[PDB]
Design a protein around this ligand. Sequence first.
Ligand SMILES: *[C@@H]1O[C@H](CO[C@@H]2O[C@@H](C)[C@@H](O)[C@@H](O)[C@@H]2O)[C@@H](O[C@@H]2O[C@H](CO)[C@@H](O)[C@H](O)[C@H]2NC(C)=O)[C@H](O)[C@H]1NC(C)=O
Ligand SMILES: *[C@@H]1O[C@H](CO)[C@@H](O)[C@H](O)[C@H]1NC(C)=O
Ligand SMILES: *[C@@H]1O[C@H](CO)[C@@H](O)[C@H](O)[C@H]1NC(C)=O
Ligand SMILES: *[C@@H]1O[C@H](CO)[C@@H](O)[C@H](O)[C@H]1NC(C)=O
Ligand SMILES: *[C@@H]1O[C@H](CO)[C@@H](O)[C@H](O)[C@H]1NC(C)=O
Ligand SMILES: [Zn+2]
Lengths: 200, 596
Amino acid sequence: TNLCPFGEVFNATRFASVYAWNRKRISNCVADYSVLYNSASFSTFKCYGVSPTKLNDLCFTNVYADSFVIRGDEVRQIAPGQTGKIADYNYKLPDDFTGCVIAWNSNNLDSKVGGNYNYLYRLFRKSNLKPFERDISTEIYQAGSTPCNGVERFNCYFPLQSYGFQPTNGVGYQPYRVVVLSFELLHAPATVCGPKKSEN
Amino acid sequence: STIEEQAKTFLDKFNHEAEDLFYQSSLASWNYNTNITEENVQNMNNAGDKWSAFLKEQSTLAQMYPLQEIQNLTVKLQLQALQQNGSSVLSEDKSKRLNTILNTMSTIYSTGKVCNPDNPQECLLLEPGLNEIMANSLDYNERLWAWESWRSEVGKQLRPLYEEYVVLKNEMARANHYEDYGDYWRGDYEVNGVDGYDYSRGQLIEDVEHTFEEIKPLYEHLHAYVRAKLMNAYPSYISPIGCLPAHLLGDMWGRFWTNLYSLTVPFGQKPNIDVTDAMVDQAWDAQRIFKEAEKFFVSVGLPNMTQGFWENSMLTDPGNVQKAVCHPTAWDLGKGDFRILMCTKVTMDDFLTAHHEMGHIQYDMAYAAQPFLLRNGANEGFHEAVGEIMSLSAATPKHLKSIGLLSPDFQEDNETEINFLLKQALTIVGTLPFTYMLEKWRWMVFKGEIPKDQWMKKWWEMKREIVGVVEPVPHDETYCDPASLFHVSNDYSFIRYYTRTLYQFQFQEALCQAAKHEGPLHKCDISNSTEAGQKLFNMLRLGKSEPWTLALENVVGAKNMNVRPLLNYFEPLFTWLKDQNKNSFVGWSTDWSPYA
Ligand SMILES: *[C@@H]1O[C@H](CO[C@@H]2O[C@@H](C)[C@@H](O)[C@@H](O)[C@@H]2O)[C@@H](O[C@@H]2O[C@H](CO)[C@@H](O)[C@H](O)[C@H]2NC(C)=O)[C@H](O)[C@H]1NC(C)=O
Ligand SMILES: *[C@@H]1O[C@H](CO)[C@@H](O)[C@H](O)[C@H]1NC(C)=O
Ligand SMILES: *[C@@H]1O[C@H](CO)[C@@H](O)[C@H](O)[C@H]1NC(C)=O
Ligand SMILES: *[C@@H]1O[C@H](CO)[C@@H](O)[C@H](O)[C@H]1NC(C)=O
Ligand SMILES: *[C@@H]1O[C@H](CO)[C@@H](O)[C@H](O)[C@H]1NC(C)=O
Ligand SMILES: [Zn+2]
């Protein structure tokens, strides 16, 4: 009765582009974090502000699950205090992040011979994202001093680019699926508890 | 926003789009080279056409960021590589013309064939026909007929085209702001705007010339030793004080003296060390060979091959399934995808090649994090120098003992080592005057310092003067003997073989210094030395982002090409050669010729 639906998140068929990252609220359910944490599945499992092992002993007000695909060598940017194209322009974790970043190689699912180009990322932006901000706008990015209208297009750029995932790419270029679990602690009744603390 | 930060935004967009498009062409080309079919030819050319067209447009766009306004030298370098114009400076009538000259010269060479004067039906091509004569024949007249027929039948065809080629190429170079086509080629070594590491195009001529002066003693002594041995093999045909006849040198040009080993081996009773039989006894296959090469790089602190390397490489001839192109090649496709294509056989030769080729892969992997256009050797001589030092370590008896291809109770004697160093020098040292002299003739022709009616006169004057080699029959200006060699008639610069050769021993000396090697340099194995691996890696990872003078200084502690490490490698042979020549003339007189 009301076990948290992590399978809906981790085993989801479709994953979002990182610039349009998907959020799922996790509420009113028990969560065995240790079933995930003890998985040969995951290549990254890093927690911040919380101990990965004692997760089953904690309660939280709300838990959020952000999910998206990025390049293998961009996983290091899904962490507090990072910079780079993903951290600055796509998905930004705050310095005081409490939660876990989970990632696994999805070359088998998200690559394709000739290349899968259906995943995008923001390449250009006037400024950096604030933590947990999402920008899905598509205004032309102006890098010069001349404007971007309908005759002048010099030093102007469409802001989103496609990843290109071919199965033969090296590990750093292969697609990785990412789930960021946010453990939120309000002054309010908990709704998500480990198995150890199941009597709310 | 400044022109520089506009240029960096343009480069961000260039890099993302370039890497994927280059990758697709790399894939198509891979598919052809591993599976020859008409269909895959088409894919390869389609993808290569798209890549070329993309580079043409990007070059046009990059032209809008003037170099004046760029401080950041990592940005300036990328822009520099993008706004090079090459043959596009020419009109399209001239550009179409020079391409025709190029393609005619190339086809005249690869289809050139000579026929028995008696029988107009027994004909030979350069490969395998003439080369086989020039490599194995001991008959003065037959070697002479092959040497002369090639140059008179193919060379005379090339002569009018090469003169025109010089004019157009020089025009291109001037419209690209170079003095002439030679100055254009020396640009690969140029460094500007990096304080204390700059290097001018003209300095290459002097540094080549100064380093050659220090190779002359070793060369002269090798020459005199070979000359005495050749008098035994061709009794009435060679003066003990004159130049070596050009058709007796073991290949069509004397480019290497490799195939004189049988005639000049110091100690014919001592067989060379060849672990081919041992590898067959121990049931080695191609996989084992490349696993051993992988072990060698890890032992010095370098990474393993990637998982993709093992899944996607072609390490053996696919034989009855597909047709493949079997030249050993190290492929850097981009996007973390590194491969080797090699039809490996279970021989000592292929064991050593695998180390060589995998050294290219190590270079490629170390500089993958550099921006796209900076992923390359620090100049045209670096990659091959990295590959060659890997064969050096891997062929030493010390190394082969360690891996169980020589018995733990094996010992190197004086005579085998001298045999080895002599063989080495015939290839490595013998090509250096050849390579220098040939390029000097081209640099001077491109500068307009040799008038057309003296092309062959000055060619053979410089052969006699610098190389110690004399034409067996006189040749007038209807000949174009330099174009009788692939690189000349196919438009490839040649000094790279000189600079790379010096680099490789500079690298080895420094790396062996770091591994605390003791004894003669030629015996050094850098395995298990992470201090040597780290010194190499500090240069490898630079790719093309730094001056080659700095990349060199990272390995060897100096900024200059330097022949002393080469001379060091050969020191035991030098002293030995000096003793052998004690009753001989050392040097030569230009005055003697076989036809005087
Ligand atoms: C390279 O050549 C261009 C001019 O050649 C044309 O443009 C190329 C991009 C290519 O498309 C060729 O086929 C064309 O023939 C030079 O462009 C000049 O740049 C200067 C600034 O330095 C500018 O003032 C001029 O207006 C340009 N001239 C023209 C005719 O457009 C460019 O400078 C050359 N690059 C280098 C490095 O020399
Ligand atoms: C995803 O599926 C596998 C097998 O189908 C299952 O064992 C695993 O626990 C699932 N993941 C989650 C988070 O439920
Ligand atoms: C080689 O090309 C042929 C096309 O005729 C194709 O049938 C075959 O599958 C290819 N081999 C490989 C290994 O891709
Ligand atoms: C050059 O630019 C790159 C990327 O913009 C930057 O990392 C580097 O610090 C810059 N170097 C200099 C000397 O400006
Ligand atoms: C390197 O070290 C290992 C273990 O110390 C040794 O067995 C091996 O033979 C060494 N190889 C060389 C080439 O020194
Ligand atoms: Zn090589």
